[PDB]
């Protein structure tokens, strides 16, 4: 996928149309720049020429400050599973307020939520709550390094484990300075080599069962089988980062695969749209945090047990996104992704959607997408054009071309997405 | 302060009375142990024989599951500034729900909140939001290490900077493996020596202007003057962890001191009781996160800009805890602490309360409390007895003897606290 002047000119024109369409968002951006770096507090939300500012949303719909309406296919990078105004989440928030905020003590609600997590995730015997997936993964590494007394962590290029463990572009100088060795996702022979070299000092292997932010790239069974066998052989803890993949069945990727990680990290939708993360796993590892134990590890955090997350999360798992709901949404998402790919094939379009269940990302290539290198080698210019095209069609998804279907997406939204994809292929024929 | 058998017997009896008083909390604990390590998800909430479970609370009051009522002097370790059911916070939550949850985009609300932070904190030119003080301090270290290209961080024994940077008991194997050198809090000559040895590779000095969790121990001006002069001299970033101290005036400890840190971390009450943290500081440091810049640092995080925190936090700073409110509460807290100390002096009690403004901790010693070593050397057995005594009197504060006055504490609560302290001194005369 080589950059062309024609594609760059098309991007320039699309950015210009977006800018002309959205002068109020542009004004907001100039003001926001005065208080936050680049008017930004979450890097992924920025895109050129400037990001949209949204005024309000209900269900699957939102409206920008210029008055334009969209269907939200982004769904908060998988956290926004309930849409913008779910009545059961609202009711949980109301119940939480009636219990009381900042009670400075435990409530029964945290235990009920923990039970709901333990009931449905087959390798989580005990769990602790954090305030983000970033904290969950940090605590999983804290656990593995403290238990094993080892320092080396095996992770994968393209892997994303939060703001301090971001390997989406390889090593980053802002990452917490764990001794991380990066392998290639899905590369069996290369990873086997790394584990022979490093296994002796390996505290943990940290891996998503599908690269999420890194392109909705499913792990192959052979790759995960290697990690499970070698973690056990060398005495490293296998950590499955299921922050995104947990939604894929009642029991996440582990239920689907019949493979158990030693620790599992969770985040995003499970707190019902409230701040949330969790790390859990084997009883004998997690019991090291029992505060009554001699030599207990400490896991602090002011908002860990906050009543809003405990209430909304329990509702999310037991009242809304039940195990059957997870199966249904994943089957719905599979049919959706298949339809998009069918549209590509029918039109001889050099593009595909990868992913699992209700999660997907477009890639402008028909080569196998198996690692971060494959994702990067696909056409990035067409990817940007696709984002702006979908916006003009009233469809909002990630700038990077990822959707994550919420429970509020229905036939009308799915049809509109499919139609807009067909229109993109037609209108951009010269560039494809 | 030496352990005696008499004091241990008194602790045994107090624990037994607590247990007899609270069989329903005891039942909850046994069940909670099945899903969370030690039935716990936040280490500080555990105490022997078991912790209370709270059923509900409004204002400054709460009720445990056995039906006992208390005045909450803990105030969520300073986060619970608004009490359990503040109507202005409720209204902000309602407004947030009307805007919409998980909108997957920026709203104007994040910019308004950032402006409110920048307006009142005199050294914060630009700010970014995180989901906890733990994340804020981690991002401050990420910033300092990435900008300077250096690895060494100077922090202080007794210092607490979140779940991955906990030095309350010195080094901990679960802390993120930053190269941290620990000094003695308030030790000018010792710290000067460390900075001569380490200043060349010092990325940052990380310090609370008052040890919070570590005993409400004010920093002396000479100590902070050393840190500011030496950070500037060697090119390390001075980071003031104001997660607790920010409440002490309109502009936190920095306004009071007339000393500016290079970066400031914030947390706890500023998000209005919602999940919250922030790091901010000098424009030229923070602009490194402008996503439009060549070589921009990334700062991710799903819930950074969540509408509940943006709304409630803006309300917290502009509608409730204004700069004048901060001055008034700190003066109120000073009068309160002075009254407690007066009661000690009047009764020849070998105890004191240290702190600033509306924050205080009891120490069973009349020696100067200037460092973590002083805190640890004070009588820990009387400290535990004090906690149980206050509970029996319907007064709830931290097991470690810390209070953090909320805006809902009034004359009745303050009088009851003072009375219960006098009663403790009288009833425990044999042990004092
Ligand atoms: C979003 C995400 C995280 C981080 O969670 P925040 O709550 O820190 O965004 C970690 N891992 C994966 C796989 C994620 O997708
Ligand atoms: C509570 C606290 C933190 C951590 O904040 P969480 O939101 O991570 O509890 C960090 N620093 C200080 C000084 C604190 O008091």
- How far, in Å, is the centroid of ligand 1 from the Cα of A299? 19
Question: Which residues from A are below 8 Å from B237, CB to CB?
Answer: none
- How far, in Å, is the centroid of ligand 1 from the Cα of A137? 8
Elucidation method: X-ray
Residues whose beta carbon lies within 6 Å of some atom of ligand 1: A 77, 132-134, 137, 160-163, 208, 212-213, 241, 243-244, 267-268, 277; B 301-302
Q: Report which ligand 1 atom has the smallest distance to the Cα of A276.
A: 7
- Cβ contact A54–B98 (<8 Å): no
Pairing of strands A210-211, A263-267: unpaired
Q: From CA A266, how far away is CA A264, in angstroms rounded?
A: 7
Q: How far does B368 lie from chain A, in Å, by closest CA?
A: 29
Determine contact, residues B431/B10, Cβ cutoff 8 Å. Answer: yes
Both tokens assigned to B309: 């925190």
Strands (E), A305-387: 352-356, 359-363
Burial A208-227 (b: 16+ CB within 10 A, else e): bbbbbbbbbbbbeeebbebb
> Annotated binding residues of A for 2-oxoglutarate, as ranges?
42, 268, 301, 400
- Residue B363: CB partners within 8 Å, gap ≥ 6? B215, B351, B352, B353, B354, B369, B374, B375, B378, B383, B401
For residue A359, report the phi and psi dihedrals to the nearest 5 degrees.
-110, 135
Q: How far does A224 lie from chain B, in Å, by closest CA?
A: 27
Residue in chain A closest to B275 (alpha carbons) equals A303
Q: From CA A141, how far away is CA A165, in angstroms rounded?
A: 10
The DSSP symbol for B318 reads I
Q: Considering CB atoms only, which of A99, A164, A176 is closest to B56? A: A99
Q: Report which ligand 2 atom has the smallest distance to the Cα of B213.
A: 15
- Please give the radius of gyration of chain A, using alpha carbons only, rounded to the nearest integer: 22
Task: Tell me which of B79, B212, B242, B304 to substitute to probe ligand 2's pocket, judged by most ligand atoms within 8 Å of the beta carbon.
Answer: B212
- Cβ contact A275–B274 (<8 Å): yes
Phi-psi region of B403 (alpha: psi -120 to 50; beta: other; left: phi over 0): beta
Closest residue (by CA) to atom 10 of ligand 2?
A: B161
Resolution in A: 1.9
Q: From CA A266, how far away is CA A136, in angstroms rounded?
A: 7
Question: Which residues from B are below 8 Å from A98, CB to CB?
Answer: 56
Is some CB atom of chain B closer than 8 A to the CB atom of A31? Answer: yes
Q: From CA A336, how far away is CA B419, in angstroms rounded?
A: 68
Q: Report which ligand 2 atom has the smallest distance to the Cα of A303.
A: 7
Question: Which residues from A are below 8 Å from B290, CB to CB?
Answer: 37-38, 40
Q: What is the dihedral of CA A371, A374, A375, A379, to 10 degrees?
A: 180
Q: Which of A242, A322, A281 is nearest to A126 (CA)?
A: A281
The DSSP symbol for A294 reads T
Q: From CA B311, how far away is CA B308, in angstroms rounded?
A: 5
Is some CB atom of chain A closer than 8 A to the CB atom of B80? Answer: yes
For residue B187, report the phi and psi dihedrals to the nearest 5 degrees.
-95, 100
- Cβ contact A174–B146 (<8 Å): yes
- Cβ contact A176–B166 (<8 Å): no
Both tokens assigned to B116: 């409110």
Taking the CA of B208 as reference, the closest ligand is 2
Q: From CA B339, how far away is CA B329, in angstroms rounded?
A: 15
CB atoms within 10 A of CB A188: 14
- How far, in Å, is the centroid of ligand 1 from the Cα of A32? 25
Phi-psi region of A77 (alpha: psi -120 to 50; beta: other; left: phi over 0): left
Closest residue (by CA) to atom 10 of ligand 1?
A: A161
Q: Hey, what domains does chain A have and what are their CATH numbers?
A: 1-85+326-432 (3.90.1150.10), 86-325 (3.40.640.10)
Q: How far does B403 lie from chain A, in Å, by closest CA?
A: 11
Both tokens assigned to B39: 């039935």
- Residue A95: CB partners within 8 Å, gap ≥ 6? A311
Binding site annotation covers B360? Answer: no
Residues whose beta carbon lies within 6 Å of some atom of ligand 2: A 301-302; B 77, 132-134, 137, 160-163, 208, 212-213, 241, 243-244, 267-268, 277
Residue in chain A closest to B31 (alpha carbons) equals A111
Q: From CA B227, how far away is CA B221, in angstroms rounded?
A: 10
Q: Which residue has the tokens 């400037």?
A: A50
The DSSP symbol for B152 reads E
User: Coil, strand or helix: which one is A323?
Assistant: helix
Question: Which residues from B are below 8 Å from A151, CB to CB?
Answer: 177
Question: B323-346 and B411-427 are packed helices; what angle lies between their axes, rounded to 10 degrees?
Answer: 20
* Range 309-328 of B in CB contact (< 8 A) with A: 309
Q: What is the dihedral of CA A77, A334, A218, A130, to 10 degrees?
A: 40
Determine contact, residues B133/B277, Cβ cutoff 8 Å. Answer: yes
Residue-by-residue DSSP string for A137-194:
HHHHHHHHHHHH---EEEEEET-B-STTSB-BTB--TTS---EEEEEETT-HHHHHHH
Pairing of strands B217-218, B210-211: antiparallel
Q: From CA B114, how far away is CA B304, in angstroms rounded?
A: 12
- Cβ contact A56–B146 (<8 Å): no
Q: From CA A386, how far away is CA A401, in angstroms rounded?
A: 7
Task: Tell me which of B138, B161, B166, B398 to substitute to probe ligand 2's pocket, judged by most ligand atoms within 8 Å of the beta carbon.
Answer: B161
Pairing of strands A359-363, A402-404: antiparallel
- Cβ contact B176–A292 (<8 Å): no
- Residue B102: CB partners within 8 Å, gap ≥ 6? A75, A76, A79, A80, A82, A83, A84, A273
Q: Which residues on adjacent β-strands are paired with residue A354?
A: A361
Q: How far separated are the first and last CA of chain A, in Å rounded?
A: 11
- Residue A289: CB partners within 8 Å, gap ≥ 6? A128, A296, A297, A298, A299, B37, B38, B40, B43
Residue-by-residue DSSP string for B35-65:
TSGGG-SSGGG--SS---BEEEEETTEEEET
Determine contact, residues A375/A402, Cβ cutoff 8 Å. Answer: no
Both tokens assigned to A26: 């542009």
Q: How far does A194 lie from chain B, in Å, by closest CA?
A: 22
* Range 156-185 of B in CB contact (< 8 A) with A: 162-164, 166, 172-179
Q: Which of A371, A178, A331 is nearest to A248 (CA)?
A: A331
User: Coil, strand or helix: which one is A108?
Assistant: helix
CA separation, residue A143 to residues A91, A128, A418, B298 (Å): 36, 12, 45, 26
Burial B390-408 (b: 16+ CB within 10 A, else e): bbebebbbbbbbbbbbbbb
Q: Which of A312, A360, A302, A369 is nearest to A336 (CA)?
A: A360
Q: Which of B254, B229, B256 is nearest to B241 (CA)?
A: B254
User: Coil, strand or helix: which one is B130?
Assistant: strand
Phi-psi region of A392 (alpha: psi -120 to 50; beta: other; left: phi over 0): alpha
- Please give the radius of gyration of chain B, using alpha carbons only, rounded to the nearest integer: 22
Q: Report which ligand 1 atom has the smallest distance to the Cα of B301.
A: 9
Residue-by-residue DSSP string for B350-396:
S-EEEEETTEEEEES--S---SHHHHHHS-HHHHHHHHHHHHHTTEE
- Residue A63: CB partners within 8 Å, gap ≥ 6? A54, A55, A56, A57, A69, A70
Largest CA distance in chain A: 69
Q: Considering CB atoms only, which of B100, B177, B298 is closest to A172? A: B298
CB atoms within 10 A of CB B239: 31
User: Coil, strand or helix: which one is B336?
Assistant: helix
For residue B130, report the phi and psi dihedrals to the nearest 5 degrees.
-125, -175
Question: Which residues from A are below 8 Å from B403, CB to CB?
Answer: none
Determine contact, residues B73/B403, Cβ cutoff 8 Å. Answer: yes
Q: Report which ligand 2 atom has the smallest distance to the Cα of A302.
A: 9
Determine contact, residues A67/A42, Cβ cutoff 8 Å. Answer: no
CA separation, residue B343 to residues B161, B380, B410, B423 (Å): 33, 20, 19, 11
- Cβ contact A97–B106 (<8 Å): no
Binding site annotation covers B133? Answer: yes
CB atoms within 10 A of CB A365: 16
Both tokens assigned to B242: 């104001």
Q: Which residues on adjacent β-strands are paired with residue B61?
A: B58, B71
- Cβ contact A302–B79 (<8 Å): yes
For residue A192, report the phi and psi dihedrals to the nearest 5 degrees.
-55, -40
Determine contact, residues A51/A45, Cβ cutoff 8 Å. Answer: yes
Task: Tell me which of B134, B155, B163 to substitute to probe ligand 2's pocket, judged by most ligand atoms within 8 Å of the beta carbon.
Answer: B134
Q: From CA B178, how far away is CA B166, in angstroms rounded?
A: 12
For residue B317, report the phi and psi dihedrals to the nearest 5 degrees.
-80, -35
Q: How many helices (H) and strands (E) does chain B have?
A: 14, 16
CB atoms within 10 A of CB A397: 24
> Annotated binding residues of A, as ranges?
42, 133-134, 268, 301-302, 400
Distance of CA A316 to the CA centre of its chain: 17
Strands (E), B232-385: 237-241, 263-267, 277-281, 352-356, 359-363
Determine contact, residues B66/A88, Cβ cutoff 8 Å. Answer: no
Both tokens assigned to A286: 């997690």
Q: From CA A227, how far away is CA A221, in angstroms rounded?
A: 10
Determine contact, residues B212/B359, Cβ cutoff 8 Å. Answer: yes
Q: Which residue has the tokens 């969770």?
A: A266
Q: From CA A351, how far away is CA A366, in angstroms rounded?
A: 6
For residue A259, report the phi and psi dihedrals to the nearest 5 degrees.
-125, 130
Q: Which of A7, A342, A299, A210 is nearest to B40 (CA)?
A: A299
Question: Which residues from A are below 8 Å from B38, CB to CB?
Answer: 289-293, 296
- Residue A406: CB partners within 8 Å, gap ≥ 6? A60, A72, A75, A80, A81, A82, A83
Cis previous bond, B144, omega within 30: no
- Cβ contact B174–A93 (<8 Å): no
- Cβ contact A42–B177 (<8 Å): no
- Give the angle subtended at the CA of B164 by the CAs of B146 and A299, to the nearest 5°: 160
Binding site annotation covers B301? Answer: yes
CB atoms within 10 A of CB A256: 16
- Residue A197: CB partners within 8 Å, gap ≥ 6? none
On the CB side of A407, CA atoms within 13 Å amount to: 26
Q: From CA B5, how far away is CA B257, in angstroms rounded?
A: 45
Closest residue (by CA) to atom 11 of ligand 2?
A: B161
Q: From CA B401, how far away is CA B78, in angstroms rounded?
A: 13
Determine contact, residues A301/A315, Cβ cutoff 8 Å. Answer: no
């Amino acid at each position: 996928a080589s950059d062309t002047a024609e594609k760059a000119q098309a991007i320039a024109a699309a950015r210009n149309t977006f800018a002309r369409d959205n002068p109020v968002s542009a004004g907001h951006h100039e003001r926001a720049r005065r208080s936050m770096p680049g008017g930004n507090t979450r890097s992924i939300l920025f895109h050129r020429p400037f990001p949209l500012v949204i005024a309000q949303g209900t269900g699957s719909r939102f409206q920008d400050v210029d008055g334009h309406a969209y269907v939200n296919f982004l769904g908060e990078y998988t956290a926004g599973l309930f849409g913008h105004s779910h009545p059961v989440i609202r009711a949980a928030v109301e119940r939480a307020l009636a219990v009381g905020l900042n009670l400075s003590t435990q409530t029964e609600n945290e235990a009920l939520f923990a039970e709901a997590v333990c009931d449905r995730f087959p390798s989580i015997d005990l769990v602790r709550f954090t305030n983000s997936g970033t904290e969950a993964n940090l605590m999983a590494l804290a656990t593995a390094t403290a238990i094993t007394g080892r320092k080396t962590v095996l992770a994968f290029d393209g892997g994303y484990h939060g703001g301090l463990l971001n390997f989406a572009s390889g090593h980053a100088p802002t990452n917490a300075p764990y001794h991380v060795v990066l392998g290639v996702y899905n590369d069996v022979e290369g990873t086997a080599d790394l584990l022979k070299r490093h296994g002796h000092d390996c505290a943990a292997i940290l891996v998503e069962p599908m690269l999420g932010a890194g392109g909705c790239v499913p792990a192959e069974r052979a790759f995960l089988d290697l990690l499970r066998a070698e973690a056990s052989r060398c005495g490293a803890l296998l950590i499955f980062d299921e922050v995104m993949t947990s939604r894929l069945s009642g029991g996440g990727a582990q239920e689907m695969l019949g493979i158990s990680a030693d620790l599992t990290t969770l985040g995003k939708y499970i707190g019902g749209g409230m701040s949330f993360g969790a790390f859990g796993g084997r009883r004998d590892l997690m019991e090291r945090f029992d505060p009554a134990r001699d030599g207990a590890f400490a896991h602090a955090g002011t908002f860990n047990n906050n009543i809003l997350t405990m209430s909304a999360g329990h509702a999310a798992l037991t009242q809304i996104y039940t195990r059957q709901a997870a199966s249904d949404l994943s089957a719905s998402g599979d049919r959706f992704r298949a339809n998009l790919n069918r549209i590509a094939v029918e039109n001889q379009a050099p593009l595909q959607f990868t992913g699992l269940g209700s999660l997907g990302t477009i890639h402008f290539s028909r080569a196998p997408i198996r690692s971060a290198g494959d994702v990067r080698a696909a056409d990035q210019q067409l990817k940007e054009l696709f984002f702006f095209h979908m916006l003009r069609k009233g469809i909002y998804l990630a700038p990077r071309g990822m959707y994550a279907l919420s429970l509020e997406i229905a036939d009308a939204g799915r049809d509109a997405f499919a139609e807009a994809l067909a229109d993109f292929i037609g209108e951009q024929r010269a560039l494809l």
